[PDB]
Amino acid sequence: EQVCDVFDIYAICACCKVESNEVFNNYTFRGLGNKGVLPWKCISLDMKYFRAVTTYVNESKYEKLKYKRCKYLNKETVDNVKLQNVVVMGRTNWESIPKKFKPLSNRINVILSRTLKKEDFDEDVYIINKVEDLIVLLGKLNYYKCFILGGSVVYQEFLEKKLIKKIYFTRINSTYECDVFFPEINENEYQIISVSDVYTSNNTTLDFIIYKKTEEDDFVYFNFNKKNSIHPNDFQIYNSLKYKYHPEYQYLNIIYDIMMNGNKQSDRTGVGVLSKFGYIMKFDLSQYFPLLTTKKLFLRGIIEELLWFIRGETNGNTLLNKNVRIWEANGTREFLDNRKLFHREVNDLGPIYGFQWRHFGAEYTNMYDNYENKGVDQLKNIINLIKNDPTSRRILLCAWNVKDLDQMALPPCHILCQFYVFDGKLSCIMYQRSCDLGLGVPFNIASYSIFTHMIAQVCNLQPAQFIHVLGNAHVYNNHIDSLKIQLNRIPYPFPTLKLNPDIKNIEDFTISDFTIQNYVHHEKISMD
Amino acid sequence: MEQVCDVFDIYAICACCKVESAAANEVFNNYTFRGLGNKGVLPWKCISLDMKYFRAVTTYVNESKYEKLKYKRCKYLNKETKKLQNVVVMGRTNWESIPKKFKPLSNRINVILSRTLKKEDFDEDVYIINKVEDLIVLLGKLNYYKCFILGGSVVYQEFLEKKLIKKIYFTRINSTYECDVFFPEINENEYQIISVSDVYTSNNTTLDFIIYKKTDEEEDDFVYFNFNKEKNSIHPNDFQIYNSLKYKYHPEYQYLNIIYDIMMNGNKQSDRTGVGVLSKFGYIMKFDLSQYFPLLTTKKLFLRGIIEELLWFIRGETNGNTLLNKNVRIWEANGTREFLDNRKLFHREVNDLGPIYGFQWRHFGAEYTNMYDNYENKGVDQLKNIINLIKNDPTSRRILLCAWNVKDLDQMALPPCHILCQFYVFDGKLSCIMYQRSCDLGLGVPFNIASYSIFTHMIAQVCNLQPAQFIHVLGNAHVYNNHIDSLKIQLNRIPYPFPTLKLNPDIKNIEDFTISDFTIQNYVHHEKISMD
Numbered sequence A: 001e002q003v004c005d006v007f008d009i010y011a012i013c014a015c016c017k018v019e020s021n022e023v024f025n026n027y028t029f030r031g032l033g034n035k036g037v038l039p040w041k042c043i044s045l046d047m048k049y050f051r052a053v054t055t056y057v058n059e060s061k062y063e064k065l066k067y068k069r070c071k072y073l074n075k076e077t078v079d080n081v082k083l084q085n086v087v088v089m090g091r092t093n094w095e096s097i098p099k100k101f102k103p104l105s106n107r108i109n110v111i112l113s114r115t116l117k118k119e120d121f122d123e124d125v126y127i128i129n130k131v132e133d134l135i136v137l138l139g140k141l142n143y144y145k146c147f148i149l150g151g152s153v154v155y156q157e158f159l160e161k162k163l164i165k166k167i168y169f170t171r172i173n174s175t176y177e178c179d180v181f182f183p184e185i186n187e188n189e190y191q192i193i194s195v196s197d198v199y200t201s202n203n204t205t206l207d208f209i210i211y212k213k214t215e216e217d218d219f220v221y222f223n224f225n226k227k228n229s230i231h232p233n234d235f236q237i238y239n240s241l242k243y244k245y246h247p248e249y250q251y252l253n254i255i256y257d258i259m260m261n262g263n264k265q266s267d268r269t270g271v272g273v274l275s276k277f278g279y280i281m282k283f284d285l286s287q288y289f290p291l292l293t294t295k296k297l298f299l300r301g302i303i304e305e306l307l308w309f310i311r312g313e314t315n316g317n318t319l320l321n322k323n324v325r326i327w328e329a330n331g332t333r334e335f336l337d338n339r340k341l342f343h344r345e346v347n348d349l350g351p352i353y354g355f356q357w358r359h360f361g362a363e364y365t366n367m368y369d370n371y372e373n374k375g376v377d378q379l380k381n382i383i384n385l386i387k388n389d390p391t392s393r394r395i396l397l398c399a400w401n402v403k404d405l406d407q408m409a410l411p412p413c414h415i416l417c418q419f420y421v422f423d424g425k426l427s428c429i430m431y432q433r434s435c436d437l438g439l440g441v442p443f444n445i446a447s448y449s450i451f452t453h454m455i456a457q458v459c460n461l462q463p464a465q466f467i468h469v470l471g472n473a474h475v476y477n478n479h480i481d482s483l484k485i486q487l488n489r490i491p492y493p494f495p496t497l498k499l500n501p502d503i504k505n506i507e508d509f510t511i512s513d514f515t516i517q518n519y520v521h522h523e524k525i526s527m528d
Numbered sequence B: 001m002e003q004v005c006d007v008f009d010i011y012a013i014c015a016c017c018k019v020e021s022a023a024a025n026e027v028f029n030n031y032t033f034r035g036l037g038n039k040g041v042l043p044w045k046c047i048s049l050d051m052k053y054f055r056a057v058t059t060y061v062n063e064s065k066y067e068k069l070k071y072k073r074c075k076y077l078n079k080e081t082k083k084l085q086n087v088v089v090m091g092r093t094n095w096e097s098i099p100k101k102f103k104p105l106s107n108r109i110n111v112i113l114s115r116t117l118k119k120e121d122f123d124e125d126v127y128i129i130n131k132v133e134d135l136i137v138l139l140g141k142l143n144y145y146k147c148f149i150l151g152g153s154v155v156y157q158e159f160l161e162k163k164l165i166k167k168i169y170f171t172r173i174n175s176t177y178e179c180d181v182f183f184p185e186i187n188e189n190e191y192q193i194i195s196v197s198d199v200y201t202s203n204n205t206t207l208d209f210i211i212y213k214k215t216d217e218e219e220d221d222f223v224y225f226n227f228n229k230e231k232n233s234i235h236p237n238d239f240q241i242y243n244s245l246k247y248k249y250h251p252e253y254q255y256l257n258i259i260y261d262i263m264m265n266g267n268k269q270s271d272r273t274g275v276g277v278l279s280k281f282g283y284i285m286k287f288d289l290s291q292y293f294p295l296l297t298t299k300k301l302f303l304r305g306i307i308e309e310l311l312w313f314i315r316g317e318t319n320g321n322t323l324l325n326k327n328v329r330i331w332e333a334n335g336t337r338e339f340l341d342n343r344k345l346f347h348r349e350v351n352d353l354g355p356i357y358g359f360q361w362r363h364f365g366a367e368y369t370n371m372y373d374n375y376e377n378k379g380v381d382q383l384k385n386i387i388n389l390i391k392n393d394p395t396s397r398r399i400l401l402c403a404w405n406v407k408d409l410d411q412m413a414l415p416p417c418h419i420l421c422q423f424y425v426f427d428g429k430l431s432c433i434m435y436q437r438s439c440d441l442g443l444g445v446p447f448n449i450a451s452y453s454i455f456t457h458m459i460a461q462v463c464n465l466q467p468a469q470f471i472h473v474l475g476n477a478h479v480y481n482n483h484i485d486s487l488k489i490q491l492n493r494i495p496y497p498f499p500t501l502k503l504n505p506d507i508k509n510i511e512d513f514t515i516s517d518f519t520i521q522n523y524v525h526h527e528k529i530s531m532d
């Protein structure tokens, strides 16, 4: 029997990044305080979380805890003759709390001090001289759970003395000056078991993770009727998590589903795939920018491609001269000839995305022609519908021009975008007919999330949801080993995207107008 | 105080078919499914999935939960506190109908009610009882998990009348057979449906399974992660039946649950019509066409028009008169002089709908002139192309049929709501995704599901494939305000097992179907609803 298990002693903390290709690990989030106070001004949502966790009590479960504690102390009663949690603090910590919040409401307040005396305190608020006097006080109290609230000294000694059953760890994804830090967590001592959704509060993203020390028959009946070379230990870390609420799991769960249940199919490359048909993912752009964190991703190229689209260009050389090689293989002489485009100049990609967005229906000649005022300017049309008729159900942008497919270097994977406006907020669905989960889809989420921001800003709206509909969704067999590595990495809180606020027209964006902030990521993975 | 059926966990399990009586404008209720047996045996040759279910339910035990049951029954009786098995009780006629190679039923304690036979007349390991009261006595002496009454009709009736049944596990066999004995009519005041299963096909019939009921560290962590969960003027009891159900696995709940979500959480918006809506953005529904045809059952739907509309599409027609002459009025309001003038289509003849679905499917990119023109070999015949892709390049990820022709939208009576179909082929089976930009949940979506489920069958058949999944992606999904009260009624109806769709197998080209090549079979449905 362990003391922390008998007396249910937990730690709860909130750590930021600290002012120093930077490498990342859990120890990236370690900033606790600065000059006796919190490193940040105010992060309300963590405050609300901290209070919610340290005040919550379950009466109907206390008798099992009381029974266990008395058995361990060779007693029949807590006596030895309104349930609340206990919260333990350091003196410096208790001094940093403003007066009007002390003692903490609905909690048994305990202060570890070597200089304070209980006479100038109340009797509700206890003072104890060392760690051992806590265990004595807990054995004499009725309480639900015991939360170590810090600070840095208290965390360290409790952690080395193995008195912590779980750590409730808030990751504050921003950087502050700090002089005190959470002690490094030994991953052979604790491991992450649950990760929350990602949130925005007071101009920072944050999430919540949990470290752990290392009728109903009718349901069965309805399951009376309930594959690929993938082994248990392959996804040990992935399957060991209990709560996977981070939105990155929307992408990772789809990969897991394809690996476990996908259909074996052949492809042009001869690599072969596992495929499934029909998925949705939803990302809340008001709370985070969903740039994958379980590997490193770069954004300059996909931003340039998007600016290239908006200009309505079809000339692959424009990208190539900026060393954006997304379309290079699709514009070679051999690739075009295999498309039977024998009279197409190298890197002339034909009436692809940008041409369809600005000139749908115009006759394509070559990438140097002047198409001004030719065909339908869809992009201008949708921006005008969003501004002037926001409840239209016809706000769609379509790249799948059936008449021009064979003239394109290849037909679009991103068939269409539809927009939706409510209470000054813009959402976007993108339908993708063909989804390379390992390589393409991480970039695709970023492209159309950025696009949704761009459209929202030029329409004086706030982005809300990017909604990604996947058609033929596949994992190439040569990515399977790399994706096994990636599925067993635990996501970090997402970054944020900042657009130059001065840009008010869709055509005025330049590469320098986009900034990714606070991107914390695992190391790059060559998909192979 | 405590009821006998509660102490001893006495359940009924049965399978009921429809019974020959049939007519047009037939009314349906729970009592529609009441056929138990014919001439002392079952009315059907063999429905194996029900047999599998019946075996799983009546053989399943949970050892962990026995100790609580053992204490409960000891307390009731004033008693002191091989493998666990269930008890199964059969009437003598029921026992005699089971082939010998299955008797006594495996892994279960067998009990037979009889007066004309005594234990000496049986070779098998079975208990004979001659009164219901003796079963209760026997149950007090045995160690067992649950007690299931297996019929026949006499046994069912007397155990219901004695109020000895705690739950009825009831299979609805959605086909008609000759019957001479019948499950008793169930009292809605005495028993209510609490769970409904997925719909299945077994041995050329659909069926589902319903249940009538008699009328820790990580646990706290879950509370923690919900710390930030904090609308529309809809009352609780308005969805009393809908929220009473425990398990809603019938595939019709994919539609019903979306309606509920829009009513509870939808956004109040204006719209092009002026009625106003509640709306949400982005849903997916999946229907398994190998197991059922998803024609909604919580209200009456007709399919003749949408089939004729689909055949009109495939012919490439844009002439609304063609449908009107078949007394199909789906497109009538979009073809009037007034409607076309408001579309600024002043030079368009009445009922000339312009370059809409049919024209885009057979002639995408051709210049539209009028509904009477000869368009042969003009534009892209994408319907022909995707059939050829499905036959000759089935792994292609480019098998896509698109009605949203951006150049032609303003020439259309109205822009298409069904933007595109993508197809997927694996293991000789065809699946279809349809993307719908705008979805009238009350009136349009029920018909749209049916239309594209039929189209998936037609494309599957002419490509010698079997239909697998119809997948329906909703973009702007809305409920019109004038539909809300109709939908409140409908959401409190329990779905029936789905019908089946059958096609003339001789039709081998997509263009060769006629209205008489389609048969919907065993459509059981609630009353038609006027959405108002």
Ligand SMILES: NC(=O)C1=CN([C@@H]2O[C@H](COP(=O)(O)OP(=O)(O)OC[C@H]3O[C@@H](n4cnc5c(N)ncnc54)[C@H](OP(=O)(O)O)[C@@H]3O)[C@@H](O)[C@H]2O)C=CC1
Pocket (backbone or CB within 6 Å): A012, A013, A014, A015, A031, A032, A033, A034, A035, A036, A037, A038, A039, A089, A090, A091, A092, A093, A094, A096, A112, A113, A114, A115, A116, A128, A129, A130, A131, A149, A150, A151, A152, A153, A154, A155, A157, A180
């Ligand atoms: N972000 C977060 O999650 C949290 C951050 N903080 C920040 O942390 C900082 C303070 O942490 P820190 O500076 O380490 O000070 P602490 O909060 O660790 O308290 C330290 C004091 O507590 C007393 N104490 C500590 N250990 C013992 C012991 N074993 N027996 C008796 N008395 C003991 C001593 O006071 P004496 O001199 O009487 O011995 C010591 O000086 C502040 O800036 C605060 O804002 C605080 C709480 C949570």
Ligand SMILES: NC(=O)C1=CN([C@@H]2O[C@H](COP(=O)(O)OP(=O)(O)OC[C@H]3O[C@@H](n4cnc5c(N)ncnc54)[C@H](OP(=O)(O)O)[C@@H]3O)[C@@H](O)[C@H]2O)C=CC1
Pocket (backbone or CB within 6 Å): B013, B014, B015, B016, B035, B036, B037, B038, B039, B040, B041, B042, B090, B091, B092, B093, B094, B095, B097, B113, B114, B115, B116, B117, B129, B130, B131, B132, B150, B151, B152, B153, B154, B155, B156, B158, B181
């Ligand atoms: N589809 C389904 O779910 C099921 C269908 N069936 C069908 O049901 C039909 C048979 O049902 P049914 O005809 O009603 O006959 P039952 O199976 O109900 O058994 C009736 C006989 O059981 C004995 N019995 C019943 N109650 C008592 C009692 N209280 N005390 C003593 N003996 C009793 C008597 O046998 P005796 O004459 O020896 O006294 C009575 O004649 C068959 O067609 C069978 O295939 C059967 C089970 C389930």
Ligand SMILES: CCc1nc(N)nc(N)c1OCCCOc1ccccc1/C=C1\CCOC1=O
Pocket (backbone or CB within 6 Å): A012, A013, A014, A038, A046, A047, A049, A050, A051, A093, A096, A097, A098, A101, A104, A148, A149, A150, A168, A169, A170
């Ligand atoms: C940063 C919040 C927090 N977060 C998590 N996850 N763990 C913690 N150990 C933690 O610190 C709580 C103890 C310290 O608390 C305060 C410290 C400084 C100022 C105010 C407070 C508390 C307040 C103010 C309003 O109401 C309170 O209770």
Ligand SMILES: CCc1nc(N)nc(N)c1OCCCOc1ccccc1/C=C1\CCOC1=O
Pocket (backbone or CB within 6 Å): B013, B014, B015, B042, B050, B051, B053, B054, B094, B097, B098, B099, B102, B105, B149, B150, B151, B169, B171
């Ligand atoms: C239709 C089955 C059934 N279905 C549900 N839902 N409820 C029931 N009360 C039920 O009857 C089971 C008792 C009678 O059973 C048989 C009757 C005729 C022939 C065979 C059997 C039993 C067999 C054969 C295979 O193994 C068996 O047990």
Ligand SMILES: O=c1ccn([C@H]2C[C@H](O)[C@@H](COP(=O)(O)O)O2)c(=O)[nH]1
Pocket (backbone or CB within 6 Å): A410, A411, A413, A414, A434, A435, A436, A437, A439, A440, A441, A444, B397, B398
């Ligand atoms: O932006 C893109 C472009 C391509 N792909 C992937 C999907 C397929 O693996 C392949 C497209 O080839 P086809 O589906 O046309 O065969 O590229 C993406 O995921 N995103």
Ligand SMILES: O=c1ccn([C@H]2C[C@H](O)[C@@H](COP(=O)(O)O)O2)c(=O)[nH]1
Pocket (backbone or CB within 6 Å): A393, A394, B272, B414, B415, B417, B418, B438, B439, B440, B441, B443, B444, B445, B448
């Ligand atoms: O097959 C159809 C055709 C139309 N609608 C509905 C959706 C909208 O309520 C209305 C079309 O209006 P707009 O989206 O074009 O405004 O008709 C459907 O649900 N299904």
